Amino acid sequence: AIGGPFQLTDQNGKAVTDKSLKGKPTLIFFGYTHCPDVCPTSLFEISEVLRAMGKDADKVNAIFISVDPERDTPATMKNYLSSFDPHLEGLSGDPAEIAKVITSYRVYAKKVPTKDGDYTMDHTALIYLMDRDGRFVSPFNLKRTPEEAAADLKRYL
Template identity: 40%
Template sequence: MNRFAMTHLASRTVRRTLLAATLGLGLALAGCSDGRDAPEMPPIVGTDITGAEIGGPFTLVDKDGKTVTWKDFRGKWAMLYFGYTFCPDACPIDVQEMMMGYNAFAKAHPEAAAKVQPIFITIDPERDTPEIVGEWTAAFGKDLKGLTGTKEQVDAAAKAFAVYYGKGAETQGGYLMDHSRFVYLMNPDGEPVAMLPVDKGRQAVAADLAALVQ
C-alpha cells in the first residue's frame, strides 16, 4: 500500500471517529438539558459546544521545558488544537487556517484578540520534543503556544478534552498518527464554547471569534 493510500485510510478512520464523537456529543448535550433556557448563542459557522464535558486539568511543558498547566490560561480565551509536527497534511493545514483566522480577527479587533491564547498540544510526544514543537509552532506565528510532555501527561490532556488519537500506518518517513481534528474555543473560565470552523477557512474562524470573544 503506497503512502497516499495509507494516508487516505487514516483519514477515513479519523472521519468515522469524528462522526461518532459528534453524534455522541449531540446526545450528551440533549441528555443534559434540564428544561431551562440556556443563554442565547450568537450565530456562528462552527459548532456550539456550551455545556459539553470538555476541558480539564493538565500539566505539560513548553518549548523551553517550562511546566505549563491548564490553570495558567484562566482569565483568557483559549483556542486549542491537538495534532503532531510530523503530520504530512492535516495538521499544518488546520493550524494554518486557525492562525490565519486568529490573525485576521486580531487585526480587526486587537483589544479582544489580546484576551485569546492559541495553543497547539502534540499527540506524538515520542517524537515531538519541546524544541521540535517550538520550532514547528514558530512557523505559524509568535502567538501560537506549543506544548508537549510525557506520554502519560499527553494522554491525560487528550482525555480531558475528549480528543481521540492513536498510532496509525507506517510509512517510509515514519509512522502516521490518527487523531481528531477539533479546534476548541474555551472561555476564560475554562469552559467549552465552540468548535471553530477551520474546515470552512480562516474567514469563518475570524468571524466566529468576533462573534464569541467578549
C-alpha cells in the same frame, strides 16, 4: 466536562497548566509535527485567524497540543511552530500527562506504523473553543474568512 487539569510545557520550556489558560478564550488543536496535511493546514488557518485579530491576538490563547509526545518535545515544537503565527503556543508533556489530557478532552489518537520505525497518527481534527473560565463552548468553525472567524472569537473577550 470536556477538558480537565493538566501540567504541560510550552515550546520555550515554560510550564503551562489548565489554570494558566483561564482568563482568555482558548482555541485548542490536537495533532503532531509529522502530520502531512491536516495539521499544517489547520494550524495555518488558525494562524490567519490570529493575524486577523490584530492586537487582540494577545487576548486569546491559541494552543497546539501534540498527541505524539515521543517525538514532539519543546525544541521540536518550537522549530515546527516557527513557520506559523508567533501567538501559537505548542504544548509538550510527559507521555503520562498527554494520555490523561487526551482522555479528558475526549481526543482520539492512534499510532499507525509505516515503515522503519516511522509512523503517522490518526487523530481528532476539530478545533476546540473554551471560554475564559475554561469551559468548553463548541468546536470552532474555520470554514470562513479569517476576518469572520476573528470576529466570532472576539465575542468571547
